[PDB]
């Protein structure tokens, strides 16, 4: 808790749905947003901060709260958009040999700044005396180890708590979320959303020789004509779906009522039957 990691993770597809099946977590409270909508929001970089506290101290990890650990080792402001993921680890972090390894900085002068790490080891000076380093009646060790033992009960067990702080500065976002894809239908009147640019039409096999760096493809107008699939490296021509005009030929509503229909721009195969020019 006095020296916690600050892992800056970015440039990936953060699949938070996988985190629900990695380890049997006991706390997945996210204050900012919902986990379902979290996979559809872009972010610049996530700050992972992990530490180990007791069971009765997990309640102190909140966006604004006092306590022996909330204002002395790690404090969160009232804007935390991440989660407070935590889980018990009383399977490998508790052996009967003396657990004089951790600490929680029982002594302090004032509340630390939110999201600050104070890696210090100087002797706590309780005023009214210049302590150049001594341990008696005026200046003591500001650090104190825990008493984690396997033959204990829940509440005073090693609980690993990891928070994921989110931020959005004036920089392009890297971590957005894992995309989704469906089957690639053949030539048919369908809708397509290939990597951004959307549209409706028919996807046929194209013979164009695209460059190894060009993805899209246009014409004399500002409309996409051919596109390459961003997950199989295959070019496909986009021809707009079959539309046209409909004319009615009528000999006159005075001798008969039979009429003929003329579909313009149709190949009598994408609507007796007569194919004219």
């Amino acid at each position, epitope marked *: 808790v006095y020296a916690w990691n600050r892992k800056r993770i970015s440039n990936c597809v953060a699949d938070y749905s996988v985190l629900y099946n990695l380890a049997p977590f006991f706390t997945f409270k996210c204050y900012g947003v919902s986990p379902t909508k979290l996979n559809d929001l872009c972010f610049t970089n996530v700050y992972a901060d992990s530490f180990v506290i007791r069971g009765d101290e997990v309640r102190q990890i909140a966006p604004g709260q*006092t306590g*022996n650990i909330a*204002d002395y080792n790690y404090k969160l402001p009232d804007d935390f958009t991440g989660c407070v993921i935590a889980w018990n680890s009383n399977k490998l972090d508790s052996k009967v040999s003396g657990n004089y390894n951790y600490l929680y900085r029982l002594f302090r002068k004032s509340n630390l700044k939110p999201f600050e790490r104070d890696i210090s080891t100087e002797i706590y000076q309780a*005023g*009214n005396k210049p302590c150049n380093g001594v341990a008696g009646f005026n200046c003591y060790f500001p650090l104190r180890s825990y008493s984690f033992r396997p033959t204990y*009960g829940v509440g005073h067990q090693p609980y690993r708590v990891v928070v994921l702080s989110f931020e959005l500065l004036h920089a392009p976002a890297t971590v957005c979320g894992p995309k989704k894809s469906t089957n690639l239908v053949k030539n048919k009147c369908v809708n397509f959303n290939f990597n951004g640019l959307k549209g409706t039409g028919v996807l046929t096999e194209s013979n164009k020789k695209f460059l190894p760096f060009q993805q899209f493809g246009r014409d004399i107008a500002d409309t996409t004509d051919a596109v390459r699939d961003p997950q199989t490296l295959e070019i496909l021509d986009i021809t707009p779906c079959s539309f046209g005009g409909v004319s009615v030929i009528t000999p006159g509503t005075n001798t008969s009522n039979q009429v003929a229909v003329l579909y313009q721009g149709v190949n009598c195969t994408e609507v007796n039957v007569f194919q004219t020019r």
Partner: single-chain antibody
Amino acid sequence: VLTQPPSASGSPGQSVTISCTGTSSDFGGYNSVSWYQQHPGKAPKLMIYEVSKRPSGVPDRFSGSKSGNTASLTVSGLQAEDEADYYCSSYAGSNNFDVFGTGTKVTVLGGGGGSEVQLVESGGGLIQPGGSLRLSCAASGFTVSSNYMSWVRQAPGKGLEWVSVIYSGGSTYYADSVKGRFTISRDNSENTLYLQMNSLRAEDTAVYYCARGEIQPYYYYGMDVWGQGTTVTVSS
């Protein structure tokens, strides 16, 4: 709420071995069970904080091992003339007051801090019911603005209980008895540290004690020094 024997007088100094049951656990986290010897008149004095390693004092009271689920403070062979009350502290859970125990009469016979840092109070003689009275414990020695001090009150007949806890600079936790009607406010950072009554509810008639160290999360702090209390004597 703890379990302590009402009295203990049979076999003086041979098989007394008082303790405090009613834990039903492993003393929570830090296995630090303190023992206070409240004497009538002056303030109580610390006897032992851990299960062993007694502080500078009488060496005939040690071996406070945690047998079963209770700390059995071995008091046999100490003496045969004492009139005081032994109190034990446990239940170190997060934000849990009333860590003291009931009045245990450990009088073996029955019939037969001053210059350390400082000891001052306000002297609340004939306190008007309600209002706002301030009590200070100005210490010219240890810093009154850096250490972790507390306030514990006790009434005639009833035992002690945690009434006020204040951390270094950013915590103002209150006990469950006041539930909010008590507002702790630190005085000047280099003069003293006082309290505030804020319209008591006729239950604050007990005498106060401003301790320089925490009770349940007790630290060695070099020496445990207390101060004499004053009678509120409410007139509601």
